[PDB]
Amino acid sequence: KVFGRCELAAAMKRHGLDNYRGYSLGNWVCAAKFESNFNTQATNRNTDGSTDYGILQINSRWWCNDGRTPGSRNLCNIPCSALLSSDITASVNCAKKIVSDGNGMNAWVAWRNRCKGTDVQAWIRGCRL
Ligand SMILES: Nc1ccc([As](=O)(O)O)cc1
Ligand SMILES: Nc1ccc([As](=O)(O)O)cc1
Ligand SMILES: Nc1ccc([As](=O)(O)O)cc1
Ligand code: NA
């Protein structure tokens, strides 16, 4: 599924990401835009052999099991394919675990480089939430 901007903002809010760990909703919408282009089916291989999955490009080295990242943890206890669903529940639950992990949203390279410190409220302008 390719989400619309306000459509994703509504979904993330309904799942309690807004202000989760102090990160306002625009942070999560911005991250999703620059990690996946709002596409739940997005996958991208990393140099280390792991792969990033879904709307928030969750990594198989630590978070989900993709059957091919030898030496990996599956801390969200989920197959990585579950993170590609049109239903973002699994991605959201796993993201809440990641953002609690210690480095907060810095875990997401696109957020750090393209969202952090910017006017992220712009990402939810016009939405009815
Ligand atoms: N903004 C953005 C554009 C393209 C992609 As991709 O799913 O092609 O790696 C991901 C994010
Ligand atoms: N050889 C081997 C291949 C894949 C995995 As796994 O990414 O499912 O944990 C573990 C070991
Ligand atoms: N200056 C400023 C910085 C961030 C935010 As907000 O995205 O946490 O609502 C609001 C104002
Ligand atoms: Na894994």
Side-chain angles (χ1 to χ4, degrees):
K1 175 174 172 69
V2 183
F3 272 85
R5 180 178 56 89
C6 291
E7 180 185 19
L8 183 61
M12 287 177 151
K13 179 168 178 169
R14 165 172 55 95
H15 280 115
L17 272 189
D18 51 316
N19 301 323
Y20 189 88
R21 289 312 187 253
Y23 290 94
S24 73
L25 187 61
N27 281 287
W28 297 103
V29 177
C30 185
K33 169 66 176 175
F34 297 131
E35 289 288 355
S36 73
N37 208 14
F38 295 158
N39 178 9
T40 63
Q41 297 195 68
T43 60
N44 288 101
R45 179 100 70 153
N46 306 126
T47 299
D48 68 359
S50 64
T51 297
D52 286 341
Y53 296 79
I55 198 88
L56 288 164
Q57 287 296 274
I58 288 163
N59 153 269
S60 63
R61 163 81 185 77
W62 305 96
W63 309 104
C64 62
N65 184 353
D66 74 357
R68 63 166 195 196
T69 308
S72 83
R73 309 281 251 87
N74 172 8
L75 297 164
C76 291
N77 191 27
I78 196 106
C80 301
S81 63
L83 312 178
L84 304 179
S85 174
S86 55
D87 175 358
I88 73 170
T89 300
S91 282
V92 168
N93 284 153
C94 186
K96 287 174 170 176
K97 174 165 318 83
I98 298 172
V99 78
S100 294
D101 192 59
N103 83 158
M105 288 196 76
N106 294 294
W108 286 276
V109 175
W111 177 79
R112 183 169 41 78
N113 290 331
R114 304 177 80 176
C115 303
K116 184 185 190 175
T118 75
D119 177 20
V120 300
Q121 194 281 152
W123 290 91
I124 64 170
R125 180 282 163 305
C127 310
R128 200 177 177 93
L129 323 141

